Amino acid sequence: VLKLSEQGVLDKLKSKWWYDKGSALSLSNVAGVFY
Amino acid sequence: DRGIQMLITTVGAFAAFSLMTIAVGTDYWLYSRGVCREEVMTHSGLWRTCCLEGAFRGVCKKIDHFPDTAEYLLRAVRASSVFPILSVTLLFFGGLCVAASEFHRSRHSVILSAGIFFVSAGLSNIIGIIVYISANAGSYSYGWSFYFGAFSFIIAEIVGVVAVHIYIEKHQQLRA
Amino acid sequence: STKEFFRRSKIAVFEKMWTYMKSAEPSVFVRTTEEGMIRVRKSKGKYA
């Protein structure tokens, strides 16, 4: 685990499996009175 | 001022019809941040949204309008853009009646019928804008296409004021 | 330790933060915590 941590393997695996996964009134409130 | 009022109507009808046709065709209605197929700054319209920068710049795909009857009707109406294309149809007919007034001066209802078509187009255009804003909502900026549509609505209504003004003046002169 | 943490980071967000901090001119770095506190207080919300 220490070797894998120091070699960036855990970081790469994390980045791969986690990141790479990837007010005023509105007219809709008064839209009835305009129609 | 009968000559200049008729010239004002003719120039306005051409200007109002041209701006609506440009507004519907031009795809610069809204500057949004969407995708072209990561999200990029794009320029939207009535049928297609296309990117403004990046690798996929210049190329784009038809807007997928479709992703409970209330939202289904609203989505269908804004999908077909019926109201703005309806305003274009009314404006085209309004220009026909304005042009046909010179060719057939015997009938009097011709110029009035033109006046109603110009104001009817304005009513159709304002419904489309309200529906378009309502549907899109369900940061952004409006491009010159939106202002071209709105400006033509002001021109369309102004010509409608002048059109029926001539009809009243010409009928007032005949009766009294 | 914070500068060393950002320098040796491989997380996308912190690598981006370090890439920015290393190039920023004038130096975004300070010599004392009091210095950074005064820099945030006197930068009118333009320094974090």
From Swiss-Prot, chain B:
It comes from Rattus norvegicus. The keyword Membrane applies. GO terms for molecular function: channel regulator activity; ionotropic glutamate receptor binding; PDZ domain binding; voltage-gated calcium channel activity. Keywords: Calcium, Calcium channel, Calcium transport, Ion channel, Ion transport, Membrane, Phosphoprotein, Transmembrane, Transmembrane helix, Transport, Voltage-gated channel. Belongs to the PMP-22/EMP/MP20 family. CACNG subfamily. Regulates the trafficking to the somatodendritic compartment and gating properties of AMPA-selective glutamate receptors (AMPARs). Promotes their targeting to the cell membrane and synapses and modulates their gating properties by slowing their rates of activation, deactivation and desensitization. Does not show subunit-specific AMPA receptor regulation and regulates all AMPAR subunits. Thought to stabilize the calcium channel in an inactivated (closed) state. GO terms for biological process: neurotransmitter receptor localization to postsynaptic specialization membrane; positive regulation of synaptic transmission, glutamatergic; postsynaptic neurotransmitter receptor diffusion trapping; protein localization; protein targeting; regulation of AMPA receptor activity; transmission of nerve impulse. The L-type calcium channel is composed of five subunits: alpha-1, alpha-2/delta, beta and gamma. Acts as an auxiliary subunit for AMPA-selective glutamate receptors (AMPARs). Found in a complex with GRIA1, GRIA2, GRIA3, GRIA4, CNIH2, CNIH3, CACNG2, CACNG4, CACNG5, CACNG7 and CACNG8. Interacts with AP4M1 and GRIA1; associates GRIA1 with the adaptor protein complex 4 (AP-4) to target GRIA1 to the somatodendritic compartment of neurons. It is found in: Membrane. GO terms for cellular component: AMPA glutamate receptor complex; dendrite; excitatory synapse; glutamatergic synapse; postsynaptic density membrane; Schaffer collateral - CA1 synapse; somatodendritic compartment. The chain crosses the membrane at residues 4-24, 80-100, 111-131, 148-168. It is a multi-pass membrane protein. Its main location: membrane. This is Voltage-dependent calcium channel gamma-3 subunit.
Curated annotation (Swiss-Prot), chain C:
Phosphorylated at Ser-43 by PKC. It comes from the Eukaryota. It is found in: Cell membrane; Endoplasmic reticulum membrane; Postsynaptic cell membrane; Postsynaptic density membrane. Homotetramer or heterotetramer of pore-forming glutamate receptor subunits; heteromeric assembly can be the result of both receptor subtype and flip-flop forms and according the composition, one partner can be dominant with respect to the fast desensitizing current component, whereas the other can determine the steady-state component. Tetramers may be formed by the dimerization of dimers. Found in a complex with GRIA2, GRIA3, GRIA4, CNIH2, CNIH3, CACNG2, CACNG3, CACNG4, CACNG5, CACNG7 and CACNG8. Interacts with HIP1 and RASGRF2. Interacts with SYNDIG1 and GRIA2. The M4 transmembrane segment mediates tetramerization and is required for cell surface expression. The postsynaptic actions of L-glutamate are mediated by a variety of receptors that are named according to their selective agonists. This receptor binds AMPA (quisqualate) > L-glutamate > kainate. Belongs to the glutamate-gated ion channel (TC 1.A.10.1) family. GRIA1 subfamily. The chain holds residues 668 to 715 of 907 of the full protein. It comes from Rattus norvegicus (Rat). This is Glutamate receptor 1. The modification Phosphoserine is found at S43. Detected in cerebellum (at protein level). L-glutamate binds at S1, T2. Ionotropic glutamate receptor that functions as a ligand-gated cation channel, gated by L-glutamate and glutamatergic agonists such as alpha-amino-3-hydroxy-5-methyl-4-isoxazolepropionic acid (AMPA), quisqualic acid, and kainic acid. L-glutamate acts as an excitatory neurotransmitter at many synapses in the central nervous system.
